[PDB]
Write an enzyme that holds these catalytic residues in place. Structure first.
Site, PDB file in Angstrom:
ATOM      1  N   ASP A 188      97.610  23.647  72.072  1.00  0.00           N
ATOM      2  CA  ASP A 188      98.018  24.220  70.801  1.00  0.00           C
ATOM      3  C   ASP A 188      98.280  25.700  70.872  1.00  0.00           C
ATOM      4  O   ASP A 188      99.268  26.159  70.343  1.00  0.00           O
ATOM      5  CB  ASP A 188      96.954  23.967  69.774  1.00  0.00           C
ATOM      6  CG  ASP A 188      96.771  22.501  69.504  1.00  0.00           C
ATOM      7  OD1 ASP A 188      97.792  21.792  69.396  1.00  0.00           O
ATOM      8  OD2 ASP A 188      95.614  22.057  69.410  1.00  0.00           O
ATOM      9  N   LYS A 239      87.906  13.951  72.775  1.00  0.00           N
ATOM     10  CA  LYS A 239      88.862  14.965  73.278  1.00  0.00           C
ATOM     11  C   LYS A 239      88.430  15.508  74.641  1.00  0.00           C
ATOM     12  O   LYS A 239      89.269  15.680  75.528  1.00  0.00           O
ATOM     13  CB  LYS A 239      89.098  16.140  72.288  1.00  0.00           C
ATOM     14  CG  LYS A 239      90.420  16.881  72.556  1.00  0.00           C
ATOM     15  CD  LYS A 239      90.616  18.177  71.748  1.00  0.00           C
ATOM     16  CE  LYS A 239      91.119  17.967  70.318  1.00  0.00           C
ATOM     17  NZ  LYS A 239      92.409  17.212  70.219  1.00  0.00           N
ATOM     18  N   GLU A 287     101.870  24.861  69.799  1.00  0.00           N
ATOM     19  CA  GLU A 287     101.996  23.879  68.732  1.00  0.00           C
ATOM     20  C   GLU A 287     103.180  24.284  67.828  1.00  0.00           C
ATOM     21  O   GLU A 287     103.330  25.451  67.560  1.00  0.00           O
ATOM     22  CB  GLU A 287     100.727  23.976  67.902  1.00  0.00           C
ATOM     23  CG  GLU A 287     100.681  23.246  66.578  1.00  0.00           C
ATOM     24  CD  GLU A 287     100.649  21.738  66.712  1.00  0.00           C
ATOM     25  OE1 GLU A 287     100.808  21.221  67.836  1.00  0.00           O
ATOM     26  OE2 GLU A 287     100.434  21.062  65.674  1.00  0.00           O
TER      27      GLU A 287
HETATM   28  O1  LIG Z   1     101.452  12.904  71.099  1.00  0.00           O
HETATM   29  C1  LIG Z   1     100.846  13.184  70.040  1.00  0.00           C
HETATM   30  C2  LIG Z   1     100.182  14.412  69.938  1.00  0.00           C
HETATM   31  C3  LIG Z   1      99.503  14.731  68.757  1.00  0.00           C
HETATM   32  N1  LIG Z   1      99.469  13.852  67.716  1.00  0.00           N
HETATM   33  C4  LIG Z   1      98.798  14.162  66.418  1.00  0.00           C
HETATM   34  O2  LIG Z   1      98.922  15.577  66.100  1.00  0.00           O
HETATM   35  C5  LIG Z   1      97.692  16.068  65.590  1.00  0.00           C
HETATM   36  C6  LIG Z   1      97.229  17.099  66.592  1.00  0.00           C
HETATM   37  O3  LIG Z   1      96.823  16.588  67.861  1.00  0.00           O
HETATM   38  P1  LIG Z   1      95.861  17.471  68.832  1.00  0.00           P
HETATM   39  O4  LIG Z   1      96.695  18.672  69.227  1.00  0.00           O
HETATM   40  O5  LIG Z   1      94.583  17.787  68.050  1.00  0.00           O
HETATM   41  O6  LIG Z   1      95.674  16.561  70.023  1.00  0.00           O
HETATM   42  C7  LIG Z   1      96.712  14.890  65.445  1.00  0.00           C
HETATM   43  O7  LIG Z   1      96.562  14.588  64.054  1.00  0.00           O
HETATM   44  C8  LIG Z   1      97.320  13.762  66.284  1.00  0.00           C
HETATM   45  O8  LIG Z   1      97.221  12.469  65.680  1.00  0.00           O
HETATM   46  C9  LIG Z   1     100.168  12.615  67.856  1.00  0.00           C
HETATM   47  O9  LIG Z   1     100.176  11.804  66.908  1.00  0.00           O
HETATM   48  N2  LIG Z   1     100.830  12.313  69.000  1.00  0.00           N
HETATM   49 MN   LIG Z   2      95.064  20.106  68.661  1.00  0.00          MN
HETATM   50 MN   LIG Z   3      98.182  19.647  70.026  1.00  0.00          MN
END
Ligand SMILES: O=c1ccn([C@@H]2O[C@H](COP(=O)(O)O)[C@@H](O)[C@H]2O)c(=O)[nH]1
Ligand SMILES: [Mn+2]
Ligand SMILES: [Mn+2]
Length: 179
Positions: free
Chosen positions: A92, A118, A64
């Site tokens: 991440d 998820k 991340e």
């Molecule tokens: O392609 C993406 C990947 C992640 N997120 C955003 O980044 C944060 C982390 O996503 P995740 O790693 O929990 O999936 C969340 O708030 C999600 O909305 C996006 O908007 N688009």
């Molecule tokens: Mn995440």
């Molecule tokens: Mn992520």
């Protein structure tokens, strides 16, 4: 010029804010307009970094916050050297102690609802999931919560503070309803 945008910029450190702006521009989204999402990305970033800081020294590889291309390069290096299965979606972190990828989640709703969404969406029995809410709940794959309680407690504390700061500016309901 939204209140949320200015709130985010004074709530999160400048390094987090700049990584969030990069992420959104890469998604093709505008922080000045999609302001609740700007806040969510900043939150997600901060939690992920606080979480990597819970380990022993070399425990986590941090995925991340990198550029998309370099993020997948590092994923590949890890897959191609631990033999672990290549995930379909960017995780991440990678946990070198437990040899698994982690996707950390931060939700304004029920942690079970978001865990399932998820769970299905990743579709990878391999990748570990760990969800925190803004009300102090967490839920992890196999009830195996990775870090000790102290490192998780401080994350939950920080999220509740973020919730209060928003609520004291009348930004909370709007941010909660937008998820
Ligand atoms: O392609 C993406 C990947 C992640 N997120 C955003 O980044 C944060 C982390 O996503 P995740 O790693 O929990 O999936 C969340 O708030 C999600 O909305 C996006 O908007 N688009
Ligand atoms: Mn995440
Ligand atoms: Mn992520």
């Amino acid at each position: 010029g939204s209140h949320m945008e200015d709130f985010v910029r004074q709530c999160f450190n400048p390094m987090i804010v700049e990584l969030a702006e990069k992420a959104m521009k890469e998604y093709g989204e505008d922080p000045k307009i999609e302001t609740n999402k700007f806040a969510a990305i900043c939150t997600h970033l901060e939690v992920c970094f606080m979480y990597s800081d819970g380990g022993s020294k070399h425990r986590f590889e941090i995925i991340e916050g990198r550029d998309r291309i370099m993020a997948w390069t590092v994923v590949n290096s890890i897959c191609n050297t631990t033999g672990v299965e290549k995930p379909k979606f960017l995780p991440d972190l990678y946990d070198y102690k437990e040899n698994r990828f982690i996707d950390i989640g931060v939700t304004r709703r029920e942690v079970h609802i978001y865990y399932l969404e998820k769970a299905n969406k990743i579709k990878s029995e391999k990748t570990h999931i760990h969800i925190f809410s803004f009300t102090g709940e967490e839920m992890a794959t196999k009830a195996d919560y990775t870090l000790d309680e102290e490192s998780r407690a401080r994350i939950k504390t920080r999220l509740f503070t973020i919730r209060q700061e928003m609520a004291s500016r009348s930004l909370w309901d709007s941010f909660r309803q937008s998820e």
